[PDB]
Design a protein around this motif. Structure first.
Motif, PDB file in Angstrom:
ATOM      1  N   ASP A 100     -19.710  36.118  18.022  1.00 35.03           N
ATOM      2  CA  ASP A 100     -18.557  35.306  17.673  1.00 35.03           C
ATOM      3  C   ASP A 100     -18.703  34.858  16.222  1.00 35.03           C
ATOM      4  O   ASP A 100     -19.718  35.108  15.566  1.00 35.03           O
ATOM      5  CB  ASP A 100     -18.407  34.103  18.612  1.00 35.03           C
ATOM      6  N   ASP A 104     -13.403  36.050  10.834  1.00 34.00           N
ATOM      7  CA  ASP A 104     -13.273  34.870  10.002  1.00 34.00           C
ATOM      8  C   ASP A 104     -14.472  34.785   9.061  1.00 34.00           C
ATOM      9  O   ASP A 104     -15.494  35.451   9.249  1.00 34.00           O
ATOM     10  CB  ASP A 104     -13.188  33.600  10.848  1.00 34.00           C
ATOM     11  N   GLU A 106     -16.663  32.600   8.721  1.00 32.81           N
ATOM     12  CA  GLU A 106     -17.836  31.869   9.197  1.00 32.81           C
ATOM     13  C   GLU A 106     -19.119  32.666   8.977  1.00 32.81           C
ATOM     14  O   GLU A 106     -19.178  33.868   9.252  1.00 32.81           O
ATOM     15  CB  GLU A 106     -17.690  31.543  10.682  1.00 32.81           C
ATOM     16  N   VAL A 107     -20.146  31.978   8.478  1.00 33.55           N
ATOM     17  CA  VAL A 107     -21.496  32.513   8.315  1.00 33.55           C
ATOM     18  C   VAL A 107     -22.473  31.478   8.868  1.00 33.55           C
ATOM     19  O   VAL A 107     -22.316  30.280   8.601  1.00 33.55           O
ATOM     20  CB  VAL A 107     -21.832  32.840   6.846  1.00 33.55           C
ATOM     21  N   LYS A 108     -23.449  31.929   9.661  1.00 31.76           N
ATOM     22  CA  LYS A 108     -24.446  31.057  10.280  1.00 31.76           C
ATOM     23  C   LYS A 108     -25.820  31.407   9.738  1.00 31.76           C
ATOM     24  O   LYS A 108     -26.186  32.586   9.676  1.00 31.76           O
ATOM     25  CB  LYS A 108     -24.440  31.191  11.810  1.00 31.76           C
ATOM     26  N   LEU A 156     -35.769  25.131  15.855  1.00 31.36           N
ATOM     27  CA  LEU A 156     -34.860  26.123  15.300  1.00 31.36           C
ATOM     28  C   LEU A 156     -33.533  25.462  14.939  1.00 31.36           C
ATOM     29  O   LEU A 156     -33.074  24.542  15.623  1.00 31.36           O
ATOM     30  CB  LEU A 156     -34.653  27.260  16.305  1.00 31.36           C
ATOM     31  N   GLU A 158     -29.389  25.809  13.354  1.00 32.15           N
ATOM     32  CA  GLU A 158     -28.172  26.603  13.296  1.00 32.15           C
ATOM     33  C   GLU A 158     -27.245  26.063  12.217  1.00 32.15           C
ATOM     34  O   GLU A 158     -26.064  25.802  12.477  1.00 32.15           O
ATOM     35  CB  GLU A 158     -27.485  26.656  14.660  1.00 32.15           C
ATOM     36  N   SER A 160     -24.640  25.495   9.554  1.00 39.41           N
ATOM     37  CA  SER A 160     -23.414  26.204   9.255  1.00 39.41           C
ATOM     38  C   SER A 160     -23.150  26.258   7.756  1.00 39.41           C
ATOM     39  O   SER A 160     -23.462  25.319   7.017  1.00 39.41           O
ATOM     40  CB  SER A 160     -22.252  25.514   9.958  1.00 39.41           C
ATOM     41  N   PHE A 162     -20.101  26.233   6.261  1.00 41.60           N
ATOM     42  CA  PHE A 162     -18.993  25.359   5.886  1.00 41.60           C
ATOM     43  C   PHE A 162     -19.140  23.946   6.438  1.00 41.60           C
ATOM     44  O   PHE A 162     -18.143  23.341   6.860  1.00 41.60           O
ATOM     45  CB  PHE A 162     -17.666  25.951   6.360  1.00 41.60           C
TER      46      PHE A 162
ATOM     47  N   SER G  32     -12.382  28.045  21.724  1.00 45.08           N
ATOM     48  CA  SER G  32     -12.809  29.441  21.756  1.00 45.08           C
ATOM     49  C   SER G  32     -13.589  29.774  23.027  1.00 45.08           C
ATOM     50  O   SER G  32     -13.327  30.801  23.659  1.00 45.08           O
ATOM     51  CB  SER G  32     -13.641  29.754  20.508  1.00 45.08           C
ATOM     52  N   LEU G  48     -15.241  27.683  10.876  1.00 46.78           N
ATOM     53  CA  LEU G  48     -16.477  27.059  11.327  1.00 46.78           C
ATOM     54  C   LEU G  48     -16.349  26.775  12.810  1.00 46.78           C
ATOM     55  O   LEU G  48     -15.252  26.505  13.304  1.00 46.78           O
ATOM     56  CB  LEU G  48     -16.797  25.774  10.558  1.00 46.78           C
ATOM     57  N   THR G  49     -17.491  26.737  13.506  1.00 47.71           N
ATOM     58  CA  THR G  49     -17.508  26.412  14.932  1.00 47.71           C
ATOM     59  C   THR G  49     -18.381  25.184  15.160  1.00 47.71           C
ATOM     60  O   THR G  49     -19.554  25.169  14.768  1.00 47.71           O
ATOM     61  CB  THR G  49     -17.991  27.606  15.763  1.00 47.71           C
ATOM     62  N   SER G  52     -21.786  23.997  19.921  1.00 53.15           N
ATOM     63  CA  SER G  52     -22.371  25.337  19.880  1.00 53.15           C
ATOM     64  C   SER G  52     -23.739  25.394  19.171  1.00 53.15           C
ATOM     65  O   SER G  52     -23.888  26.006  18.109  1.00 53.15           O
ATOM     66  CB  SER G  52     -21.367  26.302  19.235  1.00 53.15           C
ATOM     67  N   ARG G  53     -24.745  24.727  19.764  1.00 51.75           N
ATOM     68  CA  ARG G  53     -26.136  24.832  19.318  1.00 51.75           C
ATOM     69  C   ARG G  53     -26.935  25.795  20.220  1.00 51.75           C
ATOM     70  O   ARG G  53     -26.371  26.515  21.049  1.00 51.75           O
ATOM     71  CB  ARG G  53     -26.758  23.433  19.255  1.00 51.75           C
ATOM     72  N   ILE G  54     -28.268  25.820  20.055  1.00 54.17           N
ATOM     73  CA  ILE G  54     -29.158  26.665  20.866  1.00 54.17           C
ATOM     74  C   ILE G  54     -29.055  26.313  22.348  1.00 54.17           C
ATOM     75  O   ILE G  54     -29.155  27.192  23.213  1.00 54.17           O
ATOM     76  CB  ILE G  54     -30.613  26.542  20.366  1.00 54.17           C
TER      77      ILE G  54
END
Lengths: 199, 212, 35, 347, 265, 105, 66, 63, 153, 348, 63, 66, 69, 51
Positions: A100, A104, A106-108, A156, A158, A160, A162, G32, G48-49, G52-54
């Motif tokens: 997902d 778009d 979006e980059v993670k 860990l 995540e 984002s 943006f 989503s 952006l989302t 929604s973490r680990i």
């Protein structure tokens, strides 16, 4: 933000010569060469990118000067604003991406430590930031290596791209830093004189 | 504006541009001003006889613009064809009113002294170039400071300076004449070279530096 | 330039009007779609 | 395309360094560097020579083949002869730049001698060529005008020019030359209506020619000469148009006829106090002028006449009618409308 | 209160003022990269929002400019602004799938074939699901068609002009049809029903036009063009604001700005 | 201008009378001769840019552009004459057709 | 001057700091993906989302009104 | 010419001026893609304005 | 990590008169051999557009040298391979610059001069020579500079 | 002038140096004098080559400036784009004008934009709208399935895809086509003839590939546009243009052109077995169908040009092509144009 | 070398230069994760930059 | 001093700017009129009405929770 | 002088109003009277000084500016 | 909008200072306030326009 200023004489018309965004290196001789003092090292004092040039002069006092000022490689990041694009679908006929956040912009970025995340953050945008250098880009002049942090206590991440609406990479760099637990600044590379380093 | 020059024995067109404008590179635009065919400067006149108007040879004049007008296409087009008519256009043309040159020099600072004349046939006389300047200066000098019906503070107080011929009056007259002459921006400077007295007669002469 | 308020002719540079609509696919968006 | 001084000199330097190992100094002052600069300057000048040749070629070189002449503002020149009292006894000198001033006061023209001439030891007369200072047509002078010399002498008697200065020349723009050639290219049209019309208008005493076209026959008629066509002009123009007519198609030439119209119109005016002899006279003059200026084969539409007569003044006129005009009058192709008798009643 | 003078013609409309160096006491003027943007847009009044209505925004950028400064946005709110095939298709989805959403599955069939209207394809599906099959009696009952004709899908005739002229002579055989409108409507509909479907090319409005001229001229118009006709006839504010906004403010770098102390006038 | 006039003003410009062999004079003479031959060629190039004097390949180009190609064993003059004449067909006239038949004959 | 070269934004000079990071107001998003076991969704911003973490579903997500 | 274009403009109606402004805007947004007529081209557009005003290029004029 | 190659160049690269000054020897360099095998065996990525209307595009294939003088056409291919080999290492993957030596470029220039002189006879095809003379001086700068680069790196 | 090569100039310089009273000098290789001579010779060669190129450019520019005959500009690419929605629309939707269609592949970043309004009526699972390439060049001729992006698109849209490659964009007018049209103009200076009528008909930019049929006293011109149609306004414009050019006293009439349909059913043999795929089949079908269009009137269905045209795509990849029924050229009448035709590809 | 490189790049088509920019950006991504023709290395890039235009090393030059 | 005469507010000196224009928090209103076709209302402030543009009902209004 | 059905809204709250429309066009919007119209008006004025006449009543009733016919 | 005595008697000098703004004072001071508790009703009559 780190900033420096240079005063220049009015002998030549510098306004027509020194184009913006050029790189200036300064070297200072502390003491006498032949004396064989420890100060004979030609240590670099500062390096940065110019961002302003202006005539200056008070003709009442019968004197004029040219002034140039810049910042130590904070200009690229601060100006590069990760903007937001609102109306782009980016679809495909009867095909789609299993991850997902695709189609778009979006980059993670994911990593178990700051040096892992920061490597991915810097490496994502640094090469494509192109300029008209006759010889390279910011990646040759900035090492941005030998980074570390509390890997054991940090899980860990995540983070984002943006997280900040149309903000600069410096704004996004601050989130990754997680101050005051980690110290971020720009300084000369003593181990490799002649070039800067991101710490 | 421009500077005059002449073709010297076996001088190349490169040499001129380099000496006056510094860079040799400019000769290329400089030939268009003098409207020259490829053999731009050529030594022999029997070779100029090939097609006389489109060449220069040893002893001929040349035109040399100022650097600002060097790149102007209009200056190129005008200098190409006008040639000697440059000076006349650059310092002006108007009607000649110095009909009675012997006469106006008998009654100056009095009115009714100048008059139209006729030269050629069926057309009022006109003056041009340096003589355009001799006319206007001579008239302007012999006109009192507030007597033209518009743009006053034009003319001189020469009609007011008649006095006991002691030297202070003579320096005063000198200064008025110099102010008079230096009023027109086309003239650079004036200076006196002689003042001389003969009882109740003043006499003197002034040198004026007219732009090229 | 002084004539009729013309000003500097270089003010209307070659980038004044030449442009194009803004969309993605310029950086990072296109790398995944190289099928 | 042309290359500048810098590129040629840089290529020469780079090729010398590639070839030659002996040479390494290129300071301003080396015999070798200025040898190369001299070479490069001559090469650049040859490049500019080719550039100018190409410019001339694109401007007029292709058109020069086809027979027309170009003008380059050449100043006027002509032969002039000088006479002396007695035969000479020395080789007299005649400098270039000598001025031959006009003897006539009304002529401000002046002339100069481009090349030096040396009088013979004993020749009593010599002819030389003199060029005018002023270009254009203004440099032309009539015969017997040049009779004075600035560098006069005792031996010199008088000067005269037997032949008039004909070489006066004036240069026009590229458009006027390009237009002259187009006028010829377009003249090389035949077997068309437009070409036939031009070819008829070529001959003098041809104006307002009208052409009527039909698959069967082609008929041409005109009112060129004072509103009438003569038989002699018909004969002349029939022979001329033979080159213009299509092959295998008949050509016919006829005269122009006219049809005089009789009309007695009536006009109602809102304000009857305004009527008078002058008003009806002006109305009749306007009507007759309008009816006179009708194009060939133009049908007399009553609607246009109504518009024309009412457009004199909308407030004045309220109603109009024609006693003796039923409908529009159709005319053949050769007929033209004329005013025979016009009368206007006021109501 | 005037529009901004950065427009070309409006810039020329400003009065010029001259001042030579002879009145300059001190000067401090130079370039600067303090203002720098790549993307320019003029959003409309902030009530309108992308997830609940019409087009939200329309930006503008230069491809060369964004290399140095990537995705640098500049936003301003402006307050102002075929029996077999049909049966096969139903058999392909199946009665279990078709029974869930008969209204929208109906739109699939009507989308694929524009011969069937929404009502026509709605009724056949209802008859299919309830009975479990559709026969040639059901199809023809829904709409009159030649079910026993398989020519047309491979080959259908050209209908050159003389054929149309002949078909009109069949559909109008007596003069009363022009006078009696009631049968005229029946006649023309029967003409259009075969003429649109059976042959290579079909159009309602074009064929109608021909029929209206044909009827008016009593079937013999003054020109053969009436029979040609069917054969030859058948075979910003958002952008402007975003543009001008880019024009004004893209050139912030390379411009000069400061403060000048001219002589007091 | 020509290579002699512009070259370094301290260098020689004429044969030495002390000895017969002058490598300086040989070099300058050779370069002068080459660049004056190139100059003559470049002045003659003006004629090839005009159809009135174009010859050989440039006349062929002109013909090809006008559509009149060169006949086998055709000299330049007749080929240029036909190329120029080709514009003036004045086709359609009976005497034009007679002229075209006389040309064809 | 030399010292002014710091983080700034707007036509008028304003000190950008940790206040600018904080959002002002409410924003919209689209659903989503949903965690059916916990009934806590993850909403997507335009690029952006959120959420929604680990954590799969329980330990991190966006709550829904009841 | 410029000095009497100002004079001719004094008389114009409101609609004429509004159309003049609109035409000027329309020309403007699609551009990039010592008075002496002898020996100079400085007074070029001034004479055009007068001629365009009196003859009538549009309801008001252009430039 | 290789930039895709144009279709034209890829097709071109995959396969009596004598001059008194310079003559050829038909000798290939070791570095040129390795590249040739790589292109022969491995399927290198290739582009789809052909916007760049230069080099062999409508110049080396348009000329009749391909059919008239195939031996001369073999020289041109060798120069392209040798020109493409040296450009390969410096731009990307510099590990292959170890196999290049001075004599590799020396023979290439001699081959360039011979084919260039032969093309001077033809008056149509001088466009090809225009690029070859510029390329000729390019190889000489590498020839007089390649021994220093390897020792520096 | 005549082209002089390096070797000749070098020999001439050597001979002048030897003859110039110089025996000491030598021209072995490696010398400074030999290198300078060679450099000068190469400069003169460069000058001669650039002179010849400038002469050619000058000839072209003089021919352009001559007459009023000039080449016309390029045509913008255009084509159809297909929209696929998740479900049929429940209510009528409006598409804003100037919607931007683009792609995501790096090879084709060229944009597109619509010119007119469009409306998506309810109960419609797809809509097709025409699009025009903003860039003026051949880059708009994108292959199948390239344009896969839409700006300001709602969530209803499921997929964006073009069913057929454009193959309509063009570059600047070809030198050969300009040369041929200029020949037509030169031959057409003599009015009242077949070629004059031909040029007078062809000078309109819309019409393409006209034909003339000359019956006794009775010209007829068979004119059509790129689509094969002839609108009344364009027909009247052609008639008015030809009126000046029409021979006097002879009938002229026009009646368009009648199309004809033939199915080629072509079959192609492909060397590379891996490269074979549906995409290549679609590209071959589109290329053949496009070849069928943009064909002038009154020309036989030549098969040699067809096979050379389809082999032009790739000489190596495409091996051979054969046909079943149209192996003999089909002679077309004066009023026939071969434009329609259904293409079935049968790969061996 | 610089001069003729610049002339080449001026002569290139806009799509050609766009592809050259793409190739430069790709190379930059792959980075990780006084002049004399003799006895000098500063002019090395000028000889290499002059190439990739006489030889089609990608649709446009590199660096 | 002379330069201080700018937009300001409060007992303590504060630079009034485009931050003050932005509302902080939530506010109450009353439902004056409803668009029954779109079910989007227009709410009235004590002396102002929100929503309620030239658009009758669809293209502008205030959404309601579902 | 707007066309028919031009005035769509009241530009206010319009809580109880659905829509507004005009069935007829505006024709009374006119430019300033020309010289000819003024001369016609003045000749009627000169001829209307005597009362008890039809031509007098014409001016009598035409004096209001809004009246045209 | 302001007048004030000024003077440093150490330096033996005093002055009066006056300052103002170019017609920005009326608008800037005129605050469109809000009235909270006013109905403004009428007996069996009301305005057709809202607001």
């Amino acid at each position: 933000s780190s900033v420096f200023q240079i005063n220049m004489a009015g002998d030549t018309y510098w306004d027509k010569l020194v184009m913006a965004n050029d790189i200036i290196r300064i070297f200072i001789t502390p003491n006498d060469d032949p004396n064989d003092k420890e100060g004979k090292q030609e240590r670099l004092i500062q390096v940065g990118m110019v961002s302003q040039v202006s005539k200056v002069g008070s003709y009442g006092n019968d004197q004029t000067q040219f002034r140039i000022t810049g910042q130590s490689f904070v200009k690229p990041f601060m100006k590069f604003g990760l903007g937001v694009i609102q109306e782009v679908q980016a679809v495909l006929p009867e095909v789609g991406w299993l991850i997902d956040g695709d189609g778009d912009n979006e980059v993670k970025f994911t990593g178990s430590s700051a040096h892992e995340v920061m490597t991915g953050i810097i490496r994502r945008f640094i090469p494509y930031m192109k300029y008209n250098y006759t010889e390279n880009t910011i990646d040759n002049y900035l090492d941005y290596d030998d980074l570390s942090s509390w890997d054991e206590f940090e899980k860990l991440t995540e983070v984002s791209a943006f997280t900040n609406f149309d903000g600069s990479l410096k704004q996004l760099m601050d989130m990754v830093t997680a101050r005051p637990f980690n110290e971020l600044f720009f300084k000369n590379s003593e181990k490799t004189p002649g070039k800067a380093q991101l710490v | 504006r421009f500077k005059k020059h002449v073709v010297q024995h076996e001088e190349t067109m490169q040499a001129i541009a380099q000496r006056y404008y510094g860079d040799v590179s400019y000769w290329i635009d400089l030939v268009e001003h003098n409207n020259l065919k490829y053999p731009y400067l050529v030594e022999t006149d029997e070779e100029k006889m090939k097609d006389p108007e489109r060449l220069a040879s040893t002893g001929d004049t040349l035109i040399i613009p100022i650097e600002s007008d060097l790149t102007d296409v209009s200056a190129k087009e005008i200098n190409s064809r006008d040639k000697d008519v440059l000076v006349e256009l650059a310092l002006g043309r108007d009607l000649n009113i110095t009909a009675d040159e012997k006469y106006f020099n008998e009654h100056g600072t009095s009115d009714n002294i100048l008059a139209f004349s006729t030269n050629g046939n069926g057309d009022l006389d006109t003056v041009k170039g340096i003589d355009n300047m001799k006319q206007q200066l001579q008239a302007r000098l012999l006109t009192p400071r507030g007597s033209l019906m518009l743009h006053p503070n034009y003319g001189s107080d020469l009609h007011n300076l008649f006095g006991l011929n002691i030297p202070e009056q003579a320096t005063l007259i000198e200064m008025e004449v110099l102010r008079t002459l230096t009023s027109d921006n086309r003239v650079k400077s004036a200076n006196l070279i002689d003042w001389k007295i003969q009882g109740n007669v003043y006499s003197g002469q002034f040198s004026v530096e007219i732009k090229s | 330039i002084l004539e009729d308020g013309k000003g500097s002719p270089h003010r209307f540079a070659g980038l004044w009007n030449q442009s194009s609509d803004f969309m993605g696919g310029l950086m990072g968006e296109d790398t995944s779609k190289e099928l | 395309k042309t290359r500048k001084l810098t590129n040629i000199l840089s290529k020469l330097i780079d090729k010398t360094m590639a070839g030659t190992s002996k040479i390494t100094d290129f300071t301003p002052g080396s015999a070798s560097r200025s040898l190369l600069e001299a070479v490069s300057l001559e090469i650049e000048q040859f490049y500019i020579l080719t550039k100018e040749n190409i410019d001339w070629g694109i401007q007029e070189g292709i058109i020069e083949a086809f027979d027309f002449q170009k003008r380059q503002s050449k100043r006027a020149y002509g032969d002039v002869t000088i006479q002396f009292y007695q035969p000479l006894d020395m080789r007299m000198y005649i400098p270039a730049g000598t001025t031959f001033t006009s003897t006539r006061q009304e002529y401000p023209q002046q002339f100069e001698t481009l090349v030096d001439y040396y009088a013979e030891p004993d020749s009593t007369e010599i002819v030389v060529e003199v060029y005018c200072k002023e270009t254009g047509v203004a440099g032309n002078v009539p015969e017997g005008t040049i009779n004075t010399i600035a560098s006069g002498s005792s031996l010199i008697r008088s000067v005269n020019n037997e032949y008039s200065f004909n070489t006066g020349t004036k240069e026009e723009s590229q458009e006027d030359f390009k237009r002259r050639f187009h006028s010829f290219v377009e003249s090389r049209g035949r077997a068309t209506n437009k070409s036939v019309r031009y070819g008829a208008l070529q001959i003098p005493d041809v104006e307002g020619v009208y052409v009527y076209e039909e698959t069967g026959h082609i008929t041409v008629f005109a009112h060129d000469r004072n509103g009438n066509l003569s038989d002699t002009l018909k004969e002349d123009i029939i022979d001329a148009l033979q080159d213009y007519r299509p092959s295998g198609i008949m050509l016919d030439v006829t005269g122009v006829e006219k049809e005089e119209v009789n009309v007695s119109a009536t006009v109602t005016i809102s304000n009857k106090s305004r009527i008078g002899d002058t008003l009806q006279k002006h109305i009749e003059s306007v009507i007759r002028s309008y009816l006179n200026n009708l194009k060939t084969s133009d049908d007399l539409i009553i609607t246009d006449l109504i518009q024309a007569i009412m457009n004199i003044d909308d407030v004045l006129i309220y109603d109009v009618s024609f006693d003796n005009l039923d409908e529009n009058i159709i005319v053949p192709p050769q007929g033209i409308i004329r005013a025979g008798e016009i009368k206007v009643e006021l109501k | 209160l005037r529009k901004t003078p950065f427009n070309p013609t409006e810039w020329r409309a400003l009065d010029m003022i001259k001042v030579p160096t002879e009145d300059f006491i001190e000067e401090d003027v130079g370039k600067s990269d303090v203002e720098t943007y790549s993307i320019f847009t003029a959003t409309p009044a902030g009530m309108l929002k992308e997830l609940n209505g019409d087009v939200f925004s329309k930006p503008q950028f230069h491809p060369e400019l964004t290399d140095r400064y990537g995705y640098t946005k500049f936003e301003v709110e402006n307050i102002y602004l075929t029996y077999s095939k049909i049966m096969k298709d139903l058999s392909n989805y199946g009665r279990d799938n078709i029974s869930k959403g008969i209204d929208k599955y109906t739109s699939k069939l009507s989308s694929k074939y524009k011969n069937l209207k929404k009502a026509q394809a709605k009724k056949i599906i209802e008859k299919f699901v309830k009975e479990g099959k559709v026969t040639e009696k059901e199809y023809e009952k829904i709409t009159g068609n030649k079910v026993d004709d398989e020519l047309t899908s491979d080959n259908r005739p050209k209908l050159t002009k003389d054929k149309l002229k002949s078909i009109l002579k069949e559909k109008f055989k007596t003069q009363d049809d022009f006078n009696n409108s009631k049968k005229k409507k029946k006649a023309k509909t029967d003409a259009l029903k075969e003429l649109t479907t059976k042959y290579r090319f079909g159009n309602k409005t074009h064929a109608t036009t021909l029929l209206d001229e044909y009827i008016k001229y009593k079937g013999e118009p003054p020109n053969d063009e009436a029979f040609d006709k069917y054969l030859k006839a058948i075979e910003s504010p958002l952008v402007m604001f975003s543009r001008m906004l880019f024009n004004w403010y893209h050139g912030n770098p390379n411009f000069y700005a400061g403060d000048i102390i001219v002589l007091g006038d | 201008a020509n290579f002699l006039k512009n070259l370094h003003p301290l260098l020689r410009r004429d044969r030495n009378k002390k000895d017969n062999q002058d490598p300086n004079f040989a070099l300058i003479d050779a370069l002068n001769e080459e660049m004056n031959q190139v100059e003559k060629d470049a002045i003659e190039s003006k004629l090839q840019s005009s159809l009135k004097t174009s010859t050989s390949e440039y006349l062929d180009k002109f013909g090809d552009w006008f559509g009149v190609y060169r006949k086998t064993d055709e000299k330049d003059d007749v080929y240029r004459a036909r190329i120029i004449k080709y514009l003036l067909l004045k086709r359609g006239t009976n005497n034009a057709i007679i002229d075209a038949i006389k040309d064809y004959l | 001057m030399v010292v002014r070269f710091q983080s700034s934004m707007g036509r008028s000079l304003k000190r950008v700091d940790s206040d600018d990071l904080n959002v002002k107001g409410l924003v919209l998003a689209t659903v989503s993906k949903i965690n059916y076991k916990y009934q806590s969704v993850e909403v997507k911003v335009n690029n952006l989302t959120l959420g929604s973490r680990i954590g799969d579903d329980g330990s991190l997500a966006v709550p829904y009104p009841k | 010419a410029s000095q009497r274009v100002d004079e001719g403009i004094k008389e114009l109606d409101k609609n004429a001026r509004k159309t003049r402004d609109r035409n000027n805007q329309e020309i403007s947004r699609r551009e990039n893609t010592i008075y002496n007529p002898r020996q100079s081209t400085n007074g070029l557009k001034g004479n055009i304005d007068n001629m365009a005003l009196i003859i009538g290029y549009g309801d008001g004029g252009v430039s | 990590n290789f930039i895709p190659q144009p279709q034209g160049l890829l097709r071109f690269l995959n396969t009596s008169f004598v001059s008194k000054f310079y003559t050829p020897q038909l000798q290939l360099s070791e570095l040129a051999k390795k590249v040739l095998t790589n292109i022969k065996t491995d399927d290198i990525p290739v582009l789809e557009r052909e916007f760049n209307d230069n080099t062999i595009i409508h110049k080396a294939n348009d000329t009749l040298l391909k059919v008239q003088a195939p031996r001369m056409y073999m020289i041109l291919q060798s120069i392209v391979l040798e020109a493409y080999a040296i450009v390969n290492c410096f731009v990307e993957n510099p590990s292959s610059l170890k196999y290049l030596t001075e004599e590799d470029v020396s023979i290439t220039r001699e081959n360039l001069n011979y084919v260039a002189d032969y093309l001077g006879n033809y008056d149509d095809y001088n466009s090809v020579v225009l690029d070859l003379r510029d390329l000729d001086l390019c190889f000489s700068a590498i020839e007089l500079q390649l021994p220093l680069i390897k020792k520096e790196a």
